[PDB]
Amino acid sequence: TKQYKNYVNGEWKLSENEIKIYEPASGAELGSVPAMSTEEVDYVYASAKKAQPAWRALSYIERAAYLHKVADILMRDKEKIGAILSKEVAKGYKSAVSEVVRTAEIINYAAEEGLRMEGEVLEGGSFEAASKKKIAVVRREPVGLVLAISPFNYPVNLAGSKIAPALIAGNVIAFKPPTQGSISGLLLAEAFAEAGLPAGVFNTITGRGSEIGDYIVEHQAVNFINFTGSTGIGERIGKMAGMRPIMLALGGKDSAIVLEDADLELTAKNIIAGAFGYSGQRCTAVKRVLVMESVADELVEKIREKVLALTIGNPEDDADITPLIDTKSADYVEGLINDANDKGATALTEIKREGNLICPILFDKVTTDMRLAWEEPFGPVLPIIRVTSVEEAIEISNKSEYGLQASIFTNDFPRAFGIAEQLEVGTVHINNKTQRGTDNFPFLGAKKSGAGIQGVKYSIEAMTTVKSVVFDIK
Amino acid sequence: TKQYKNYVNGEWKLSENEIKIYEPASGAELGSVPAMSTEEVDYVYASAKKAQPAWRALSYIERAAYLHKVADILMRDKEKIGAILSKEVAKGYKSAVSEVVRTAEIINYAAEEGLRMEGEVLEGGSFEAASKKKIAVVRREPVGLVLAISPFNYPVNLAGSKIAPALIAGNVIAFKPPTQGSISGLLLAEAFAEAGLPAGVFNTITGRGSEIGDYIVEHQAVNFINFTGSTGIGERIGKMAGMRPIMLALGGKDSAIVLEDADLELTAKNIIAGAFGYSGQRCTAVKRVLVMESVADELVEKIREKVLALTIGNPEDDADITPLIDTKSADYVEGLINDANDKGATALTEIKREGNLICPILFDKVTTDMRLAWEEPFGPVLPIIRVTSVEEAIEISNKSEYGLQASIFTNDFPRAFGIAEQLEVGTVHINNKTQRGTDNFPFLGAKKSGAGIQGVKYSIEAMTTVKSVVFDIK
Amino acid sequence: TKQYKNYVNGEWKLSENEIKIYEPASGAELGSVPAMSTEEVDYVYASAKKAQPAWRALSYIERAAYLHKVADILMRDKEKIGAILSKEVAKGYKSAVSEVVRTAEIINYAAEEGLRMEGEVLEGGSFEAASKKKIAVVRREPVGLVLAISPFNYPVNLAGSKIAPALIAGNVIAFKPPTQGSISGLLLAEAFAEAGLPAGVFNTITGRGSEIGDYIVEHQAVNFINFTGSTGIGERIGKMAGMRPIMLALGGKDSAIVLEDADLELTAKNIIAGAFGYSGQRCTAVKRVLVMESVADELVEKIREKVLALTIGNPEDDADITPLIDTKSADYVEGLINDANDKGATALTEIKREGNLICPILFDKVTTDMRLAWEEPFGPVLPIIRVTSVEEAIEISNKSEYGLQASIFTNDFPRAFGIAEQLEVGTVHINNKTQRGTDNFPFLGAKKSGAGIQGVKYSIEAMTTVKSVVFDIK
Amino acid sequence: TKQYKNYVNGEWKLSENEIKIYEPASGAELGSVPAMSTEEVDYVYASAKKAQPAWRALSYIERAAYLHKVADILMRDKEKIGAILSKEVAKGYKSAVSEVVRTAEIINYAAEEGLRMEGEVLEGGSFEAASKKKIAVVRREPVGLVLAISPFNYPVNLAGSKIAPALIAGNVIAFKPPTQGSISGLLLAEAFAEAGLPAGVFNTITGRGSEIGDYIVEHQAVNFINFTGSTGIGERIGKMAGMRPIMLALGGKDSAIVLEDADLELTAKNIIAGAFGYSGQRCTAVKRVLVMESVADELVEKIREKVLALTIGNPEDDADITPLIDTKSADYVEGLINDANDKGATALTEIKREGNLICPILFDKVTTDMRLAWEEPFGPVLPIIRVTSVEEAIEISNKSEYGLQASIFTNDFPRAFGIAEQLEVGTVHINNKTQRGTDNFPFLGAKKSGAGIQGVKYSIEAMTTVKSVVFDIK
Ligand SMILES: NC(=O)c1ccc[n+]([C@@H]2O[C@H](COP(=O)([O-])OP(=O)(O)OC[C@H]3O[C@@H](n4cnc5c(N)ncnc54)[C@H](OP(=O)(O)O)[C@@H]3O)[C@@H](O)[C@H]2O)c1
Numbered sequence A, B, C, D: 001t002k003q004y005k006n007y008v009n010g011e012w013k014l015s016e017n018e019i020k021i022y023e024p025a026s027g028a029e030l031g032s033v034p035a036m037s038t039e040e041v042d043y044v045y046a047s048a049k050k051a052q053p054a055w056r057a058l059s060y061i062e063r064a065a066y067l068h069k070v071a072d073i074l075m076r077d078k079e080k081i082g083a084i085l086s087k088e089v090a091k092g093y094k095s096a097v098s099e100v101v102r103t104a105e106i107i108n109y110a111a112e113e114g115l116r117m118e119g120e121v122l123e124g125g126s127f128e129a130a131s132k133k134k135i136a137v138v139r140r141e142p143v144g145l146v147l148a149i150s151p152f153n154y155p156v157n158l159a160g161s162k163i164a165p166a167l168i169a170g171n172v173i174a175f176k177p178p179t180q181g182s183i184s185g186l187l188l189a190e191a192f193a194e195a196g197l198p199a200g201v202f203n204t205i206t207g208r209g210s211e212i213g214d215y216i217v218e219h220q221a222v223n224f225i226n227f228t229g230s231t232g233i234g235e236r237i238g239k240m241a242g243m244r245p246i247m248l249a250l251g252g253k254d255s256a257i258v259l260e261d262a263d264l265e266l267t268a269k270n271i272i273a274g275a276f277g278y279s280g281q282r283c284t285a286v287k288r289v290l291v292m293e294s295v296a297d298e299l300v301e302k303i304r305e306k307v308l309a310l311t312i313g314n315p316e317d318d319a320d321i322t323p324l325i326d327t328k329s330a331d332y333v334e335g336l337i338n339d340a341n342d343k344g345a346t347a348l349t350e351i352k353r354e355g356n357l358i359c360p361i362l363f364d365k366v367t368t369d370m371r372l373a374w375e376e377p378f379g380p381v382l383p384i385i386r387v388t389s390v391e392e393a394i395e396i397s398n399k400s401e402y403g404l405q406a407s408i409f410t411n412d413f414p415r416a417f418g419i420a421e422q423l424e425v426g427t428v429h430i431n432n433k434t435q436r437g438t439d440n441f442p443f444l445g446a447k448k449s450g451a452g453i454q455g456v457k458y459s460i461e462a463m464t465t466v467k468s469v470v471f472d473i474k
């Protein structure tokens, strides 16, 4: 077993204890990652705080450079990383490589967006005559040490989207990847080491969050917690954060609202691509379709067919639907499938599980009484809820505790815009599937789908504070 | 008993229980405010939530017109409200009227700043050539129900600063003034009532924070908590907030760094005003002078001299130093004073307390051993700490858990900017006492001094989220 | 004859020579305006320049107060001023009052928009590491003396649209209204004089442009020339401006592109309103309908009918169509009508001219060989051109030397956006008549329709410049 | 002879005629450049206009990629190009290399700054309630064909600073380098050619500016003229621009204001570097020192010494002072030296001219009566003017018809700022020599020093317009 080390204060370290990582699809052993001790966690943080001042004293262009190099390295090794990554989280090899390319892109972009952050000069005279000679020179500054924590479905991409924005602004990082993905995370950590950033600027932490999780979050060394993951852990992070700044990208139950005048063929393709992408293990996936009755039968039919075209199989074969992350997860989905069924839902696709590989199932005639109408599966299961009016679609849509994104399919644009304003989500895509898509675009969840606004530009803004220097003109 | 009432969903309501409020200076009864029950709190939030949609559906200019109407009413009644506020929190009459005027100004300014908030249009083609025809139309939206909590030292001003920004953006309000100052808060409600805002858009909650504070804060109807008060309560707010956004303005121990080249007269004049305004009961007060040894003697004598010119007395006489808010505080301050004296600090004034009226006291040669060096007094007690370099002054300054604002008196502006970057504070004033001064300016606190960035423009930004609508161009 | 006086350096001055103004509709004498000498113009500019420094020395808020005051005065006198305006430019009384009200709104809006202009702080370290301590504090400053020249169709509104934005930023104004409209212009001046703006900050000039026009514009005292008029004069001013900044709002031949999926009823209402508003004497009027052959017939009929419901008559009666500004215009318009009629266009209405009152005429099947297809009429004449594709409509549209605004009537917005990108105009309205509408919006013309970007905020940035103060932080 | 070709429509073309360019220092034949006919210019534009649409159709990131490549080419061949450039305009070989590096830097930066241009969404409801559902989606668009004309002192740098911002935004360029510098210009063109930018996107025009000058500018294909050169040709470009947008970077007489409390050694070093850089052949440069009598003798002496340390000679030997660009300029400068001399000026340095090489001369006691006090020499001659008050220094400084930049040397910053507000210039450097310094900073001149605001970000803004799409939400 290859025993990986954590990049800490400019060195690769192991821990007295470790964790063995396996392949969800095969079961093969990929290696082990350290299981840090609070003492070791304390070292990572003590290291970062000590390097922060020097890292911040650098010019924006110097930090941008280190970051571009990192991206250069990731592009160079997009094959090695994708290889492991693909195996570590059972993600299609091609898409796995793509995630690394997406990561490189986000890093380069953040580097360039961040070196152009500008300040403001406010006039006292705008508020009171007596203060006309008083001005405020407001410049942005880092919050200090940022604790980045990534999910299993994008251990690298959702690591960089937090790290790059943090570093360019002058913050130091403590990256805790998901255990089931800790290898991929350490591979990313490799690029940062090779790039040669100063020791302590970028560090990693591994170990089941189920034992050092609260510790790394509650540690007073952290000035900001940027997290993507379950809504459950999200809640707790919010409470442990106290009054400290936080970034939370949690679950979602994105609805696809289909009006009578929609382009059913296009709607169907988008709903297919979004719902089943990566077996439904995507936060922004199309997890529920709210379709008008008059066009339901036809739409459903289109979906069904296109579902059959999906490729069921293993990661190395770039199959649309691959084995779910783990057994627990698959069991969860099955529970939702059984509940939908017993209550009347009609499965138009075959319900079938083999290992942790669940075949894509299309549930029609789903009602708000079924768990599947609400709970986030994170498995290939798409329920279809029929409505008799846009207004109903709005209610059912907002009734959810989730509000990441929503889709609206219709040809009546002005109306879609009106409906978008009413949806309790961050982003509404018109005649397209939901997606974080275009990382410069803002990405945020409403209600229990998140806290804070992501998207390169917004992430930088989020992980920086302001320092205002006021004086009077003579 | 003159019984004041809360403004709830367009009507004035008493509660089965009340709390008698007395003048801190004279001890005379001022009236009573309701001691709301949780049921009543529930009805307030329910009211605000039910009113939010219609309030948001209005145009910005319409919401603006309402705020201007409130501001005009406050200006018209500046003598009325000022007179009572003066008595309720033992604040000079003139500065009390002044507090009201400043409130109308904030209200007016928020109305205009907010009616012209703009959205952005992002290019998908900026990130990937493949999305060149995809654009993101991003517009600001209200977060919902905002809970505003003001402090005793500015029950009206620090209410308007949260309320107007919140309301202009389309949020609805629940205003909880401090108990000692609740009558002033209810007088402010009068202005919103007379202005005619739709029932539910604006509401008040009164009652002992030690008995309904947790409840009004932990309530899930609250989408955002904007609070100004003690760090202790502030911390609890942070945790009770969970993942919900917050605005915290807390304690402060603003240091005034005085270099060898500082204009000692200007420095003493500024330090006297900032340290003793309203008897030191200010968050942005100059609460500790870090001055180079070589100019200490001269500076200290200028302070001592000006301190003795401060008037001591009653609010109606517009005295500089008035009785402290209550007995607990006067005790706490006197204890800080005695601890200094007993530990050896060099007192430049006689230690004197008449009831809750503590005469301005100045302690020179205070050491890091003395409580007065760190604890926020919120009384007219000013410590002087002699340093032998800017490096040390910066260390002492940052040693504090507070980091609201800082003053730097020197003639070397480039150096002042260098020092400013090192000081862990929100704002740094050069050759001027610290101050929230000019409300368009950002107002924030580092470390334990706060969370979030205030100042009209920033408050609106803080209490709004973004709604991103994405679509492809044909 | 009531002798009107120009307002110069805080004084109401007459001129040795006067120009009599007659009511276009009745021919009745309305009064007379001064006929300044080149030297009297020199005194206007000398005063302005002399008062500029002290005007700029004021705080932003103080200048805003003066403007707000002017606005209030105009609201109070809307009827008084409106009545004269109506008589002077043959604009319907009600819409004449509307111009005044709209003017106060712009004045007020510019006031609040202008006091909120902010500065920027640029980091040298964004460009080169060696300059990481160098920062640029950039703040806006006025350009100096601004010459504002308004048009006859909005002598007051297109006056304030330039004046207020210019004054708030700290510039001084020399306002030259149109001779036929000067009385209204001077009435506006009254509102400034009464507002009590410092002498010389605001001034007026009157005289035949065909005599002192080149002078007022060529005078080197003028720092910025903000103009709205004919493309002919507009170009002369362009060359006379030299390298000095300018604002040109010129002619337009806004086209209304009607696709096959357009709501024809809504399409017809908008075409009629935008085409015949003020008898077509609008720069943003609908002046040519490019409609797909298949819906041509149906659309044409809807229009023909709506045109007939238009009231025709005198301004005092608020008639839709009133006498044109002068006999020259009426002659020219008739000439364009006869050319179309003689060349074969299909008139859907009768040709009828009574004095300078031309009845609303509609020509269908207008070909590219007919003058009415390109020349801006500025009369109640509307050409309807049939096309066979969107590509053709786009071609006919851009072939024009004009490019102010355009309208697209369709049920497909994404396509409308793609077409808008192709149209060489400033603003594209979807399912709505073209319009300068909502003055905070940008207003600009491509090709020969204008230079510079108007709209309150943009006007302010146009008539201000930047002052960059660069220094190094120690 | 070494004959260069123009890069037209993606091909290298010669003309029936040509112009031979000789090394300003050795008089050797560097080579020849085409002397295009008007018909050949017509082809360059017809080609550019033809490629424009497809160039714009590309995504922002794609256009940025092309630019980055061009920058890469330049860095690879920096020595190859610096060699030729150094020879073409007789400038130190090292700085000739730096100019190329600076060019690559601006190009890379422009591509990144420009790929992030964002639009705005304006709310109708901000101006009137009736238009609350009306919004304006405002996006930036390129003006079309941009004509770039660079100066002799920076044939490469001041070309890229116009081309890149222009191109990234979607415009096509027609680059007209100065005859004396056309070889370098064409060398740059090679990088663009090797980068593979679509034919017609980037084109070059060579020929005597006195022959084809007015033609290329007046040509109607040009939508924008971005020019850097003499105030003389600038004024003409102004008129010939008509109403089309223009960017003018003309000459300057940057004053260096020295106060009594300045750091004379620091001041002097700065003045030496700024006034004599590139033999003073720079638009931004200390061309006049306005120093308080009090420290004039001391400052003068320091400058005097530092002048003697300056090297004299060939560009190949990186001498500080090189031969002026041509006989004419040297004749002109010498004339200024004589007028100043015959009027009383004291030359503290040997007035010596050998060929077109003038030794650095420092003139003391220069009065406002000497040509040298006002005219831009573009030679190694520094006049010194003794003033007795800041007020005077401000008055003299502003009496200049130039207003590019200024320098204030003092330790009283609040005062420096106050003074900077009064100086009629674009940028004011405190305790630093004037410079375009750090290209992201704004760069502009007042009065006769320019028109438009440069600096990467501002250049892009300048060469783009706006397209506004308005519609009503439903
Ligand atoms: N109730 C629901 O609706 C729902 C929905 C989806 C998932 N889940 C839960 O999520 C898990 C599997 O799904 P998932 O992998 O996407 O989610 P998850 O593992 O819960 O995601 C939480 C992320 O936070 C880290 N973490 C765990 N405990 C932490 C703590 N105390 N403090 C800070 N960080 C901590 C984890 O690291 P490690 O990887 O090292 O543990 C993990 O990367 C299961 O336990 C499942 O029950 C619940």
Ligand SMILES: NC(=O)c1ccc[n+]([C@@H]2O[C@H](COP(=O)([O-])OP(=O)(O)OC[C@H]3O[C@@H](n4cnc5c(N)ncnc54)[C@H](OP(=O)(O)O)[C@@H]3O)[C@@H](O)[C@H]2O)c1
Binding pocket: B149, B150, B151, B152, B177, B178, B179, B180, B207, B208, B209, B210, B212, B213, B214, B217, B228, B229, B230, B231, B232, B233, B236, B237, B251, B376
């Ligand atoms: N932790 C510290 O560092 C610190 C320092 C100085 C003073 N204090 C405490 O502050 C008080 C006097 O100073 P102060 O008036 O400036 O501060 P404070 O009273 O603590 O200010 C807190 C404000 O929040 C309200 N509040 C109280 N408990 C709350 C809760 N659980 N949830 C939400 N809101 C709550 C209060 O309303 P009511 O007015 O109705 O109570 C008060 O207006 C004393 O009780 C003192 O012990 C704490």
Ligand SMILES: NC(=O)c1ccc[n+]([C@@H]2O[C@H](COP(=O)([O-])OP(=O)(O)OC[C@H]3O[C@@H](n4cnc5c(N)ncnc54)[C@H](OP(=O)(O)O)[C@@H]3O)[C@@H](O)[C@H]2O)c1
Binding pocket: C149, C150, C151, C152, C153, C177, C178, C179, C180, C207, C208, C209, C210, C212, C213, C214, C217, C228, C229, C230, C233, C236, C237, C328, C329, C330, C332, C333, C376, C377, C378, C379
């Ligand atoms: N309506 C039509 O169909 C039509 C057709 C052809 C020509 N016209 C001509 O257009 C004019 C009426 O239309 P309009 O008012 O919209 O356009 P315009 O009068 O051309 O508008 C130009 C504005 O600039 C002023 N001005 C005149 N000469 C100037 C100069 N040399 N330099 C600077 N400013 C100058 C004018 O003032 P004054 O008011 O003092 O002139 C007027 O306010 C008449 O002159 C008419 O002969 C009209």
